[PDB]
Design a protein around this motif. Structure first.
Motif, PDB file in Angstrom:
ATOM      1  N   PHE A 165      18.347  76.963  93.070  1.00  0.00           N
ATOM      2  CA  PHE A 165      19.362  77.916  93.854  1.00  0.00           C
ATOM      3  C   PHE A 165      18.820  78.438  95.285  1.00  0.00           C
ATOM      4  O   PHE A 165      19.460  78.514  96.028  1.00  0.00           O
ATOM      5  CB  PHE A 165      19.794  78.785  92.853  1.00  0.00           C
ATOM      6  N   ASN A 166      17.450  78.669  95.078  1.00  0.00           N
ATOM      7  CA  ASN A 166      16.768  79.154  96.282  1.00  0.00           C
ATOM      8  C   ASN A 166      16.534  77.940  97.429  1.00  0.00           C
ATOM      9  O   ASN A 166      16.810  78.218  98.801  1.00  0.00           O
ATOM     10  CB  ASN A 166      15.684  79.924  96.240  1.00  0.00           C
ATOM     11  N   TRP A 216      19.899  77.337  99.089  1.00  0.00           N
ATOM     12  CA  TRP A 216      20.197  78.715  99.870  1.00  0.00           C
ATOM     13  C   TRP A 216      19.635  78.365 101.307  1.00  0.00           C
ATOM     14  O   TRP A 216      19.975  78.466 102.333  1.00  0.00           O
ATOM     15  CB  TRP A 216      19.948  79.797  99.263  1.00  0.00           C
ATOM     16  N   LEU A 224      21.097  75.909 103.794  1.00  0.00           N
ATOM     17  CA  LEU A 224      22.236  75.970 104.502  1.00  0.00           C
ATOM     18  C   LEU A 224      21.899  77.104 105.446  1.00  0.00           C
ATOM     19  O   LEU A 224      22.591  76.894 106.517  1.00  0.00           O
ATOM     20  CB  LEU A 224      23.334  76.653 103.401  1.00  0.00           C
ATOM     21  N   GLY A 225      21.284  78.357 105.252  1.00  0.00           N
ATOM     22  CA  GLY A 225      21.040  79.275 106.233  1.00  0.00           C
ATOM     23  C   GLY A 225      20.286  78.653 107.571  1.00  0.00           C
ATOM     24  O   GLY A 225      20.645  78.866 108.669  1.00  0.00           O
ATOM     25  N   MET A 227      23.169  76.733 109.607  1.00  0.00           N
ATOM     26  CA  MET A 227      24.090  77.863 110.131  1.00  0.00           C
ATOM     27  C   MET A 227      23.257  78.474 111.251  1.00  0.00           C
ATOM     28  O   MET A 227      23.791  79.794 111.721  1.00  0.00           O
ATOM     29  CB  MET A 227      24.482  78.540 109.086  1.00  0.00           C
ATOM     30  N   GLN A 228      22.068  78.291 111.707  1.00  0.00           N
ATOM     31  CA  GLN A 228      21.079  78.951 112.688  1.00  0.00           C
ATOM     32  C   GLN A 228      20.961  80.344 112.428  1.00  0.00           C
ATOM     33  O   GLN A 228      20.533  81.023 113.367  1.00  0.00           O
ATOM     34  CB  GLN A 228      21.640  78.591 113.834  1.00  0.00           C
ATOM     35  N   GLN A 229      20.956  80.760 111.212  1.00  0.00           N
ATOM     36  CA  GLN A 229      20.669  82.111 110.743  1.00  0.00           C
ATOM     37  C   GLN A 229      19.296  82.040 110.174  1.00  0.00           C
ATOM     38  O   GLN A 229      18.651  81.220 109.817  1.00  0.00           O
ATOM     39  CB  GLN A 229      21.515  82.681 109.594  1.00  0.00           C
ATOM     40  N   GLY A 230      18.657  83.383 110.100  1.00  0.00           N
ATOM     41  CA  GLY A 230      17.169  83.688 109.555  1.00  0.00           C
ATOM     42  C   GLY A 230      16.927  83.428 108.169  1.00  0.00           C
ATOM     43  O   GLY A 230      17.911  83.033 107.424  1.00  0.00           O
ATOM     44  N   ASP A 265      14.366  84.563 104.496  1.00  0.00           N
ATOM     45  CA  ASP A 265      13.413  85.445 103.880  1.00  0.00           C
ATOM     46  C   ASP A 265      12.283  84.625 103.219  1.00  0.00           C
ATOM     47  O   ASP A 265      11.069  85.388 102.698  1.00  0.00           O
ATOM     48  CB  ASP A 265      14.110  86.486 102.841  1.00  0.00           C
ATOM     49  N   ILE A 296      24.309  70.573 116.282  1.00  0.00           N
ATOM     50  CA  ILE A 296      24.986  71.795 116.824  1.00  0.00           C
ATOM     51  C   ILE A 296      25.158  71.680 118.298  1.00  0.00           C
ATOM     52  O   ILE A 296      26.426  71.883 118.776  1.00  0.00           O
ATOM     53  CB  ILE A 296      24.378  72.971 116.328  1.00  0.00           C
ATOM     54  N   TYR A 302      28.453  69.606 119.483  1.00  0.00           N
ATOM     55  CA  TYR A 302      29.806  70.074 119.055  1.00  0.00           C
ATOM     56  C   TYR A 302      29.959  71.243 119.652  1.00  0.00           C
ATOM     57  O   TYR A 302      31.402  71.629 120.168  1.00  0.00           O
ATOM     58  CB  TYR A 302      29.732  70.458 117.339  1.00  0.00           C
ATOM     59  N   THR A 303      29.138  72.263 120.024  1.00  0.00           N
ATOM     60  CA  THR A 303      29.300  73.513 121.056  1.00  0.00           C
ATOM     61  C   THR A 303      29.498  73.007 122.443  1.00  0.00           C
ATOM     62  O   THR A 303      30.294  73.868 123.373  1.00  0.00           O
ATOM     63  CB  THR A 303      28.139  74.358 121.154  1.00  0.00           C
TER      64      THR A 303
END
Lengths: 52, 172, 200, 95
Positions: free
Chosen positions: D10-11, D14, D17-18, D21-24, D26, D49, D52-53
């Protein structure tokens, strides 16, 4: 051809449309609100499953 | 401590009054047309002429995937749902003077207020888009609705913050 | 030589806040109710009975900050661990993209060029359309030139001027300039270029 | 027994995906075989990405789409649209 006036005679300049109207992007908000509506349901079924 | 029961009961009536008046007024949008051009204002349901000879003459609006959007705009179901949910939340916070210590009455009101705020958002976004079919501008009752959304959210927050503390104090 | 006069198509004046313009007003309005809603749902769902209320950092103020930094794409020092918290985070990240990537794009559509096409030089476009009327001085060399010359574009312009109604001609250069200024851009006056420059 | 890897399914699901999505994040992979798997997904993301941008204004708003017919052959096949000809003309004699 000297007596034609409709934009079929010339309309090729194709300047940009101004700004970006909401109707072009509204679809992005519906999936957002649907995900907000799903998360609460999942939370409540997990709650009533656990606290029993 | 304690006084937060006053703020919630005030905010609930405030939001219910704002939304019910917002649905019940003729001044959502300013535009130009004819009350069969002259300056014109429209509600959700009915449209009237102003600054014209026919001043105060009014007529029904005519609405006639490309179909379902028009059907939602014609029923305006989402405002009504938000008003119903506000009503249920208000009745549920008033009922907390009976069946005390059940503590699920308070928890229900937060979910009601949150889901009402979401249905208000959806109502706004559906209304805004259906006009895309000038120098228009939005009337005061649109801002009454947009304010009522904010009161509904704040009072949901207050109800959840009451539930957490008023339940936790049973643990010791 | 012969030359043409028309109204100046204004000059550009940016606003102070022109950088807001590549997205319509109502996007900048609805995105705030979006941020409020996402924040208050994430709070409602995080601080919900773990059965241990002390478990979780996502109080009101930390939810309100987490969702801000995520929209700026500027990172965080906390993240949700409950399934019900991870789904509300994951949907907000997907919105953020499509939106912040469409500003950057459209900003550039503009930052390319901003010009008004205008009538093209040699004024051949005066032969192509009825949208602009034109005329000459009464009893002047330019009128005789248009009457006489068999240059087909000029002969067509004469055929217009000798067939348009009401009368397009003027008695003085002052009236010609006035008929330019007043005619809302729908008229052009044909006059000697060394008299044109003095007007400008 | 070994439990040093926080990357349960599950981690791990996660983290992946993050990153797209270009997010930080942990957590990060901490061992050689994990760093190899992480480092390739970060390249794919950038190339996808940033392609597409590029074209997004011209696509959000096309003007022209849909038509009832294009060959006009189908007017022989379906009777929802009526049609006819000039009277006392060569065309009627032709048909």
């Amino acid at each position: 051809y000297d007596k034609g006036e409709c934009g079929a005679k010339d309309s090729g300049s194709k300047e940009k449309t101004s700004a970006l109207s909401l109707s072009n992007v509204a679809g992005v908000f519906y999936i957002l609100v649907g995900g907000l509506g799903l998360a609460m349901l999942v939370a409540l079924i997990e709650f009533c499953y656990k606290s029993r | 401590r304690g006084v937060q029961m006053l703020l919630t009961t005030v905010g609930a009536f405030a939001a219910f009054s704002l939304m019910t008046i917002a649905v019940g007024t003729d001044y959502w949008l300013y535009s130009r047309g004819v009350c069969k051009e002259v300056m014109t204002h429209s509600g959700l349901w009915r449209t009237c002429c102003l600054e014209g000879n026919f001043k105060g003459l009014c007529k029904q609006i005519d609405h006639f995937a490309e179909y379902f959007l028009r059907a939602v705009r014609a029923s305006s179901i989402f405002p009504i749902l938000s008003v119903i949910l506000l009503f249920m939340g208000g009745l549920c916070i008033a009922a907390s003077e009976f069946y005390k210590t059940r503590h699920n009455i308070i928890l229900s009101a937060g979910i009601f207020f949150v889901s009402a705020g979401l249905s208000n958002i959806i109502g706004i976004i559906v209304y805004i888009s259906a006009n895309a079919g000038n120098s228009y501008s939005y009337g005061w009752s649109f801002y009454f609705g947009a304010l009522s959304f904010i009161i509904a959210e704040m009072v949901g927050v207050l109800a959840v913050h009451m539930f957490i503390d008023r339940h936790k104090q049973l643990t010791g | 030589g012969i030359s043409i006069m028309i109204k100046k198509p204004q000059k550009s004046k940016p606003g102070v806040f022109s950088f807001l313009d590549p997205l319509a007003y109502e996007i900048w309005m609805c995105i705030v109710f979006a941020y409020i809603g996402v924040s208050v749902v994430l709070f409602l769902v995080s601080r919900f009975s773990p059965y241990s209320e002390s478990t979780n950092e996502f109080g009101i103020f930390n939810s309100l900050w987490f969702s801000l930094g995520a929209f700026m794409q500027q990172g965080c020092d906390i993240s949700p661990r409950s399934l019900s918290g991870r789904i509300v985070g994951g949907v907000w990240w997907f919105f953020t993209l499509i939106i912040i990537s469409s500003y950057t794009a459209n900003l550039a559509a503009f930052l390319t060029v901003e010009r008004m096409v205008s009538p093209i030089e040699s004024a051949e476009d005066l032969s192509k359309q009825t949208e602009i009327a034109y005329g000459t001085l009464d009893s002047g060399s330019t009128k005789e030139f248009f009457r006489r010359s068999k240059i087909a574009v000029f002969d067509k312009m004469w055929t217009y001027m000798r067939s348009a109604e009401p009368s397009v001609f003027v008695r003085t250069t002052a009236e010609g300039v006035a008929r330019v200024r007043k005619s809302k851009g729908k008229y052009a006056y044909l006059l000697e270029s060394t008299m044109n420059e003095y007007i400008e």
